[PDB]
């Protein structure tokens, strides 16, 4: 649970990420939505909110069978900060893995802070 608070204090650079990662209540909403790459598009709101909106890129027209459209749409916007783990693709991030998520969060922490 302390990892949730650590990630919150590290990523408050973009408060909009707190709508994906837990917002200090130590829940587990991080894995599935971060595997979809929503935080990557949100992270730009650090300096200017005038960017990819959370409800503009995804308003859950991910139909009750195919929820496969948000993950690649949001992970393709990873030009910011840069997923230095180029081993991983959106195929495996569809579900998410501990080591893979930690490796991507490594870049998130590293470039999120100037």
């Amino acid at each position: 649970y302390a990892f949730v608070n650590w990630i919150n204090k590290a990523l408050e650079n973009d408060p909009d990420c707190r709508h994906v990662i837990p917002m200090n209540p130590n829940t587990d909403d991080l894995f599935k939505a971060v595997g979809d790459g929503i935080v990557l598009c949100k992270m730009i709101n650090l300096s200017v909110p005038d960017t990819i909106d959370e409800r503009a890129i995804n308003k859950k027209k991910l139909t009750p069978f195919i929820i496969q459209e948000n993950l690649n749409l949001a992970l393709n916007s990873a030009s910011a900060i840069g997923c230095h783990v180029v081993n991983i693709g959106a195929e495996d991030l569809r579900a998410g893995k501990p080591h893979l998520v930690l490796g991507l969060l490594w870049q998130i922490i590293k470039i999120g802070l100037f």
């Binding site: 195919i66 496969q68 459209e69 993950l71 690649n72 749409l73 992970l75 393709n76 230095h84 783990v85 180029v86 081993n87 991983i88 693709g89 959106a90 195929e91 495996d92 893995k97 080591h99 893979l100 930690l102 490796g103 991507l104 969060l105 490594w106 870049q107 590293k110």
Partner: protein
């Protein structure tokens, strides 16, 4: 800052801190690519799989091994492999943490130069180092004198070390550790009404080799036992549901290490390689070499490799003095443990390849700093 030690290998790549007794990176080193058609929107958005992400989906993907016996051909997939090894199993920043690299001996300068530039340009490294796997594996056994047989997945080299000093003229390299063994097994498995062509079954074949194949003591006696009796017949459960049973092709695969005629190469086996390396050393240091045979790598864990090697060396011995084979339980991580021990030392902090020196030295900085 704590030092990092990364052990690269053709089959398994290891990483971790310096000082830790347990490894962290436990994953096959494979590359997979999508090859099927997605009729549903949102799929096909990946360039290359790396490791367990392809292991978990080994039905609809191919398998690619960018590491060919310690030779780095395609660096685009190696970038992905190193990114997998470092950030997924360290979570620390190499940009401010020293990382200890491993590299097979008798490696052309281009490979070492390119892996150095990649570290100093793709990454922003403050101080790196490149060490030989055989030398690092000697520190795992707690000794500084004796030969170390490092046999990974496609690399088999013998670097004799005497009181810390190594002999460059007694260093050779054999490209038969685990990959040609897997190829031999998947080729000979077709004699029992089986089909093994695609790489989707390569991981299953490797697992069957790891849990069934064993180094036999006498090959002719094993042939006689398999032909006459049917006692050494063990079955495997295929992931899809069928049941296979192999009794003769179990100990045939590990025998290719000692008998290279199975795969058709003029080089000698693993038992003669260390003897030839010792013969290339001094006559007054063979005493420390016969009694010090430290085993390492991913190959030498067959059930009966130590006794067979001891018998082979004794047959090669002049019947003067005892032969000792060291087979530590952590043979899979002897290189990584030795590297962690060496990097944990206070002396090892003063020859890392710093970036400021590299900026005015150039690409060949690893060549005389390692």
């Amino acid at each position: 800052t704590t030092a990092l030690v990364c052990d690269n290998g053709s089959g398994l790549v290891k990483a971790g801190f310096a000082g830790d007794d347990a490894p962290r990176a436990v994953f096959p080193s494979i590359v997979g690519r999508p090859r099927h058609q997605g009729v549903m929107v949102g799929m096909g958005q990946k360039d290359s799989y790396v490791g367990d992400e392809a292991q978990s989906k080994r039905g609809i993907l191919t398998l690619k091994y960018p590491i060919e016996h310690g030779i780095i051909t395609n660096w685009d997939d190696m970038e992905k492999i190193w990114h997998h090894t470092f950030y997924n199993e360290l979570r620390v920043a190499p940009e401010e943490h020293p990382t200890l690299l491993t590299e097979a001996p008798l490696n052309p300068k281009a490979n070492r130069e390119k892996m150095t530039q990649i570290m100093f340009e793709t990454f922003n490294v403050p101080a790196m180092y490149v060490a030989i796997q055989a030398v690092l594996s000697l520190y795992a056994s707690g000794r500084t004198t004796g030969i170390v047989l490092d046999s990974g997945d496609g690399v088999t080299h013998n670097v004799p070390i005497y009181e810390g000093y190594a002999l460059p003229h007694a260093i050779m390299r054999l490209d038969l550790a685990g990959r040609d063994l897997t190829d031999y097994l998947m080729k000979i498995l077709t004699e029992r009404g089986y089909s093994f062509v695609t790489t989707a079954e390569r991981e299953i074949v490797r697992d069957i080799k790891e849990k069934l194949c064993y180094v036999a003591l006498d090959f002719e006696n094993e042939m006689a036992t398999a032909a006459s009796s049917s006692s050494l017949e063990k079955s495997y459960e295929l992931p899809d549901g069928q049941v296979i049973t192999i009794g003769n092709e179990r100990f045939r695969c590990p025998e290719t290490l000692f008998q290279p005629s199975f795969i058709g190469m003029e080089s000698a086996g693993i038992h003669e390689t260390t003897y030839n390396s010792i013969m290339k050393c001094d006559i007054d240091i063979r005493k420390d070499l016969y009694a010090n045979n430290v085993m390492s790598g991913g190959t030498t864990m067959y059930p009966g490799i130590a006794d067979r090697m001891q018998k082979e060396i004794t047959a090669l011995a002049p019947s003067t003095m005892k032969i000792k084979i060291i087979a530590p339980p952590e043979r899979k991580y002897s290189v990584w443990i030795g590297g962690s021990i060496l990097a944990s030392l206070s002396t090892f902090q003063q020859m890392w390849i710093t970036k400021q020196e590299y900026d005015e030295a150039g690409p060949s900085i690893v060549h005389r700093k390692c």
